[PDB]
Amino acid sequence: LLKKTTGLVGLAVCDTPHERLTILYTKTLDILKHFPKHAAYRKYTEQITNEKLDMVKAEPDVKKLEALLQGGEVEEVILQAEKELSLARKMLKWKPWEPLVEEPPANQWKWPI
Amino acid sequence: GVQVSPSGEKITHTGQVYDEKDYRRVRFVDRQKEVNENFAIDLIAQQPVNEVEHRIIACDGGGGALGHPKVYINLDKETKTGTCGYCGLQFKQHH
Amino acid sequence: PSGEERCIACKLCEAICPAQAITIEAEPRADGSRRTTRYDIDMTKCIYCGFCQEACPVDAIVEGPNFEFSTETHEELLYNKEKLLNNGDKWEAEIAANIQADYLYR
Amino acid sequence: EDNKQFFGRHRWVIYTTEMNGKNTFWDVDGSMVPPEWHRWLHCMTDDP
Amino acid sequence: NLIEVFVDGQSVMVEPGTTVLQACEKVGMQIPRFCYHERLSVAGNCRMCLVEIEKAPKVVAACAMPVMKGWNILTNSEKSKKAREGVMEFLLANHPLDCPICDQGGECDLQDQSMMFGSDRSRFLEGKRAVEDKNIGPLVKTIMTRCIQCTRCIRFASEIAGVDDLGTTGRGNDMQVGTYIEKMFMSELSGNVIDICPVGALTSKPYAFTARPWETRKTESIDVMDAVGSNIVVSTRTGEVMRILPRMHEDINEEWIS
Amino acid sequence: TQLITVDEKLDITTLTGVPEEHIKTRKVRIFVPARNNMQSGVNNTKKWKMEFDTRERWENPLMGWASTADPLSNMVLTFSAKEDAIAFAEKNGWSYDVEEKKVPKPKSKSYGANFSWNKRTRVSTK
Amino acid sequence: SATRVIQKLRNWASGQDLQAKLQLRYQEIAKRTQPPPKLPVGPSHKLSNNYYCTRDGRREVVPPSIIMSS
Amino acid sequence: NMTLNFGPQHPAAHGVLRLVLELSGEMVRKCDPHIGLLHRGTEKLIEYKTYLQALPYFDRLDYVSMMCNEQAYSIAVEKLLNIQPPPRAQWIRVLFGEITRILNHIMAVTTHALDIGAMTPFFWMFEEREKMFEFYERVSGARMHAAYIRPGGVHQDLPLGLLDDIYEFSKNFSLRIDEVEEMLTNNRIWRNRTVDIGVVTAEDALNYGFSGVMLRGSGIQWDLRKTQPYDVYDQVEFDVPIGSRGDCYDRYLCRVEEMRQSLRIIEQCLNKMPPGEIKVDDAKVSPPKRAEMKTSMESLIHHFKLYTEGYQVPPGATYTAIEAPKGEFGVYLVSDGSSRPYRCKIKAPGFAHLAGLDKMSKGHMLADVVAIIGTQDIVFGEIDR
Amino acid sequence: VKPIFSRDLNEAKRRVRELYRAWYREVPNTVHLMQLDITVKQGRDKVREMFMKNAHVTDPRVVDLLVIKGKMELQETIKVWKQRTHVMRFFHETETPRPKDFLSKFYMGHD
Amino acid sequence: PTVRPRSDVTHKQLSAFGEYVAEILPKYVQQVQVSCLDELEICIHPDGVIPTLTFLRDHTNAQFKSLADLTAVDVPTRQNRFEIVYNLLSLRFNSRIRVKTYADELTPIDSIVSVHIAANWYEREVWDMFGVFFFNHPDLRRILTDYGFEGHPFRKDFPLTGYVELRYDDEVKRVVAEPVELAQEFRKFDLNSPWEAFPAYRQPP
Ligand code: SF4
Ligand code: SF4
Ligand code: SF4
Ligand code: SF4
Ligand code: FES
Ligand SMILES: [Zn+2]
């Protein structure tokens, strides 16, 4: 049975955690297809979402999904993965994979000074 | 034994006396000037010299850790008594 | 215990005082000894923190167990040297038994 | 001083009618405690 | 005429006839000292400066070693730190504990090297020596109990002041420094003997006990009243002049004062 | 975003909020400090310090404490470069006065020089 | 120091043993005139192997390592 | 809308706070708090002094939880200096820091009850607080501001026969905690007062910088004692309290469960006390004893330099967030290599809480907002600095 | 150097004119509502002389930071977070001005 | 027993995480320092501070949701004197991170309100105490200073004792302001010992 109390407050429980997690993991995989291959956020984000989605299609139990996601609870990793989806769209807007925009002065990061 | 000023007030052991043409005695009218009667200059010649049978001695001020740290003072000078630099009590060589 | 004001003018108890309350400008006593001519704590500054009673190498300043010294004007909480000396002369029988029962801890 | 009350109650003091030229029959303040008894009255020690 | 000198892996090219003190001063690491003033003669008399010279089994005195060829001076090594903490324990064995009586609270050059380069808890439990006080003059107060016999005052008085009066009498811990006959050591350049002395054994009688150097504010000026025009550190405490000290200047001053 | 191309000397008087007399009637000293002459250590003198001109410090008429007219007299400041210190003094707008860094010179000091045959460097004591 | 009727009245009001565990300290205070306690020394009050360069906690730190960039 | 100033002088603002409220009706629309009425410049004033002179600020910043903040500051200074405390002193740290936890939670439950209007545990808990301040005065000699935790372990030892009096306090404290839990949790007035009022989501409780008892009222498990092991808190075994409905009532019962759990850890602190020393055996971060000082020499040298200059502290930055019972307390010390700190930010727990009070006080009224400042437990010295 | 709002001086001068317009609009409400012991004319002259106090700066980022500091003073003046004590310490009703000639500065102190 | 014991497994795994973030953000990250105290000091560029903190909050492998601390440390040697820190703290990974950027007092930093509403008050406190513009803040209203306090006080060029000092008068019956002259001067102590303290932290000439 699904949990009545979610273990939190405000973060409401959902009825289809496998469906929302597979659907939003395929959405955050589809967002990184417009990322460049030169960007290594694409490779490491595709690695962590591919390994976690492989755990999702490996296990059908909700508490085993919590134990192999290792993110506390399933609604917490749904919330944090939708923040990761918004981060991937925002970093598509920002493009951080290019090199450093300005070198600092050489006395800026020296301690003690 | 508190000495008095020419104005009429008391003089501390630091030698401080307010002069006659100073306004700073105007907090001294109808309120008493606090002066300790036991001068530390006068209360050091009352106790006699302590006899030392060695060439050096080490005082503590009485009480061990209550008093002062244990300074070894030299007693080779016989014409002047070797004063402890922490207290001020005087030591005299016995021979 | 035989006369002789214990304050040996080290100028270290205002380097520990976080109020910056203590001005202890000294001179020699014209005796060969070493005492103070100017002591000032400030009771209005004076955080009552116990640092100067633990800094003091001869335990000259102490913090005697009083609280009945609430005054009406600001001038009477500006303890210079003679008020401090007859304060310790007033409470010397009260302080020294507490120091004798307390000096194993410090 | 007695024993069967709580702490702070069990050691106490009735003050003088006057001392040092001030009549303390009605105006009674806690600064007239002698210093040899100020250690005893605040229970810093057990012996009188 | 340059020598490749390693100071913990540095590559300092230095001229021959130098000290390991100067070879470390060109790096920035400062070897701890009591006998060696910079502008006095070399005489190893305190043995604080011990550093090892890359794997030779005796640690060497860094005052009087000319660096020869490729010697790696290990300043922060195990045997050098053991030698520094040991010699500070040797200095603080027979020192008397007059540090609140002393004029040099923060101007003590031995409290700082004990604080950064010494041990924590002394194993001295036996009994200190004590030295008869002298009558050197109305300007140089000498409490010679706490003298470490480092001979920094006798070399200045024998070489630059030129007086030949302050020399050491005796041997062991009975060896005391000063005039043997009760002689007034009082000439020009006698107040430089006060600031040369890294211990507060001998200091001033006008500035006897009046202040303490962390409380004072040190602001600089030129001299008047003798026409050398020397550089003056005035130490001010609550708007009152407490010490006049020589600011180091290699022209005019050369660290001394009248 | 576009970079703006201006070239003026910098003033942060209105940002720092100082009164006008504390800029126009004050001068500032940028200096490596002197070595304390009873010490033989150099660690005080590696930092370029900033101090102000000392104003009037009188005695408090009740006690005799140092009463200062100026709040800026308590401040000392620490840098590590003279041109960065002069950039800070030029942006704060005070009247600078810089003393250059004075170093020890390398002197050929030897122990065997102190015991020489024909020279005058033989020390009479030991 | 209450009587039995008011003690049983507040035990009826509570259900707890307030007489056994009062909130006011009667005689559970230790005696304030005490023997002087000799405080123990620490682990490094030893005259042998008292070298500070082995126990030196304030010199064992390193300036922080820049791992990747510049 | 009236632009009402709530004012410092109204006693449910804890003496300090100017809230302004642009309120339409008594349904308050927005509440804009201008803290800064107690701004003392502690972070400016810490820099110009030594480290041991910078110690008794943290007696006074969180002034209803004192020894927790000097535990925080001295654990930051000891992590800067790489000095482990002695373990007897570490058990003294956790014992008096949990006396300080009982202190701050007594003030929290008390000022929550006074702000709602229950004036009864403003005296009933304060009698046992006077019993605890006897222990504070027994160890240090000041009732509030100890400065007893130093860097390099605590300052002095305990007076003799103290631990029997701590045990006789702790056996009697449990009935008074259960008595206040009888009087104020199962009742009808507080149940009508504290249900579905001031609910924060866990997303807002993470994104608003809420920490400690706000996070435990929101139900996430983020004590800074078992998740991050500091001092000797890893040795003791406690249950953590968590909220369920997320309201102010969940903060009230998590404070009640924190009372009982801190009393449980105080019981095992008395049971598992080790013998040992009180300061570290290093004369350059700890001042030596007077008996070895009066005879030995390097003890007086290091006494002189540690009490005038202080500790020469190696450079770098640290920030050690510990569990204050208000929440996150940690100090961001930077050191220039001298004996003065260069700067520190002192982490107030309630700074981000009273930043986020504008979210949780919407849709409520004035008695609900004085109930939520009593719930959130804002005292203002650590916040205004 | 990076800008703040203004890529030149005259646009920031227009922002200064906008802030002066809003301050001149705001100040009779904070004369009438504040129960203040002044008129509106010397208050407006105080606003004008505080604008002329920092008139010498031609730097656009410095005058943009003066624009946000004047906006915070405007935000604390439109709403009444400032009171009748805080709002008119600018007039210096109690502090005597320091004299500018040499003779009175000679007589007053070592300056 | 005197020295704190060192656990280097946290040092190498947080150094691997620091190399990870320094590789994945090469545009903004200027360096990453790892101390001996198992924490990370990622020093970045102030034009792009919001990609750095949105990456540190929203990513599943960084996951620093809770901001904790935000001030400057003002070092006047540097050309950009303010050194703005962002101390953040993961609930789930039980780890800490520090983000250090720089600031001049003329060059602004774009604010981080849109990623954390914890910094609705911290950036206002920074605008009081040091005085940097924060771009697109909801309100950057002054908080800790006085209402009308000219001068950011936590910079090194502001004094300890301030410039104004309040005083009641009976001429006007207000708590008026005067330029401060002290009853007692704060005695500046020379607490820097003149001998060399740490040989590892030695400045090259
Ligand atoms: S009170 Fe103590 S520490 Fe202070 S000067 Fe006097 S003897 Fe020295
Ligand atoms: S008790 Fe008072 S005088 Fe003594 S150190 Fe503390 S604040 Fe200063
Ligand atoms: S010179 Fe000797 S007596 Fe004076 S402070 Fe230094 S160690 Fe102490
Ligand atoms: S008096 Fe001073 S300079 Fe001379 S030998 Fe003794 S410690 Fe050295
Ligand atoms: S410093 Fe070299 S022996 Fe004295
Ligand atoms: Zn003696």
Swiss-Prot record, chain A:
The modification Phosphoserine is found at S86. InterPro entries: NDUFA5. The keyword Acetylation applies. The modification N6-acetyllysine is found at K27, K33, K43, K57, K95. It is a peripheral membrane protein. One of its GO terms (cellular component) is respiratory chain complex I. Complex I is composed of 45 different subunits. Belongs to the complex I NDUFA5 subunit family. This is NADH dehydrogenase [ubiquinone] 1 alpha subcomplex subunit 5.
From Swiss-Prot, chain E:
[2Fe-2S] cluster binds at C35, C46, C49, C63. Residues 216-258 form the 4Fe-4S Mo/W bis-MGD-type domain. Belongs to the complex I 75 kDa subunit family. This is NADH-ubiquinone oxidoreductase 75 kDa subunit, mitochondrial. Its main location: mitochondrion. [4Fe-4S] cluster 2 binds at C147, C150, C153, C197. One of its GO terms (molecular function) is electron transfer activity. Residues 79-118 form the 4Fe-4S His(Cys)3-ligated-type domain. It is found in: Mitochondrion inner membrane. Keywords: 2Fe-2S, 4Fe-4S, Acetylation, Electron transport, Iron, Iron-sulfur, Membrane, Metal-binding, Mitochondrion, Mitochondrion inner membrane, NAD, Oxidoreductase, Phosphoprotein, Respiratory chain, Transit peptide, Translocase, Transport, Ubiquinone. Core subunit of respiratory chain NADH dehydrogenase (Complex I) which is composed of 45 different subunits. This is the largest subunit of complex I and it is a component of the iron-sulfur (IP) fragment of the enzyme. Complex I associates with ubiquinol-cytochrome reductase complex (Complex III) to form supercomplexes. In astrocytes, less complex I is assembled into supercomplexes as compared to neurons. Interacts with MDM2. Interacts with AKAP1. GO terms for biological process: aerobic respiration; mitochondrial electron transport, NADH to ubiquinone; mitochondrial respiratory chain complex I assembly; proton motive force-driven mitochondrial ATP synthesis. Acetylation of Lys-55 is observed in liver mitochondria from fasted mice but not from fed mice. [4Fe-4S] cluster 1 binds at H95, C99, C102, C108. It comes from Mus musculus. The gene is Ndufs1.
UniProtKB/Swiss-Prot annotation, chain G:
One of its GO terms (biological process) is ATP synthesis coupled electron transport. The modification N6-acetyllysine is found at K38. It comes from the Eukaryota. One of its GO terms (cellular component) is respiratory chain complex I. The keyword Lipoprotein does not apply. It is a peripheral membrane protein. It is found in: Mitochondrion inner membrane. Keywords: Acetylation, Electron transport, Membrane, Mitochondrion, Mitochondrion inner membrane, Phosphoprotein, Respiratory chain, Transport. Belongs to the complex I NDUFA7 subunit family. Complex I is composed of 45 different subunits. This is NADH dehydrogenase [ubiquinone] 1 alpha subcomplex subunit 7. It comes from Mus musculus (Mouse).
Swiss-Prot record, chain J:
It is a peripheral membrane protein. One of its GO terms (molecular function) is NADH dehydrogenase activity. One of its GO terms (biological process) is aerobic respiration. It catalyses: a ubiquinone + NADH + 5 H(+)(in) = a ubiquinol + NAD(+) + 4 H(+)(out). Its EC number is 7.1.1.2. Keywords: Electron transport, Membrane, Mitochondrion, Mitochondrion inner membrane, NAD, Oxidoreductase, Respiratory chain, Transit peptide, Translocase, Transport, Ubiquinone. GO terms for cellular component: mitochondrial inner membrane; mitochondrial membrane; mitochondrion; myelin sheath; nuclear body; respiratory chain complex I. It is found in: Mitochondrion inner membrane. It is an enzyme of class 7 (translocase). Core subunit of respiratory chain NADH dehydrogenase (Complex I) which is composed of 45 different subunits. Interacts with NDUFAF3. Interacts with RAB5IF. Found in subcomplexes containing subunits NDUFS2, MT-ND1 and NDUFA13. Belongs to the complex I 30 kDa subunit family. Core subunit of the mitochondrial membrane respiratory chain NADH dehydrogenase (Complex I) which catalyzes electron transfer from NADH through the respiratory chain, using ubiquinone as an electron acceptor. Essential for the catalytic activity and assembly of complex I. This is NADH dehydrogenase [ubiquinone] iron-sulfur protein 3, mitochondrial. It comes from Mus musculus. The lineage of its organism: Eukaryota, Metazoa, Chordata, Craniata, Vertebrata. The chain holds residues 44 to 248 of 263 of the full protein.
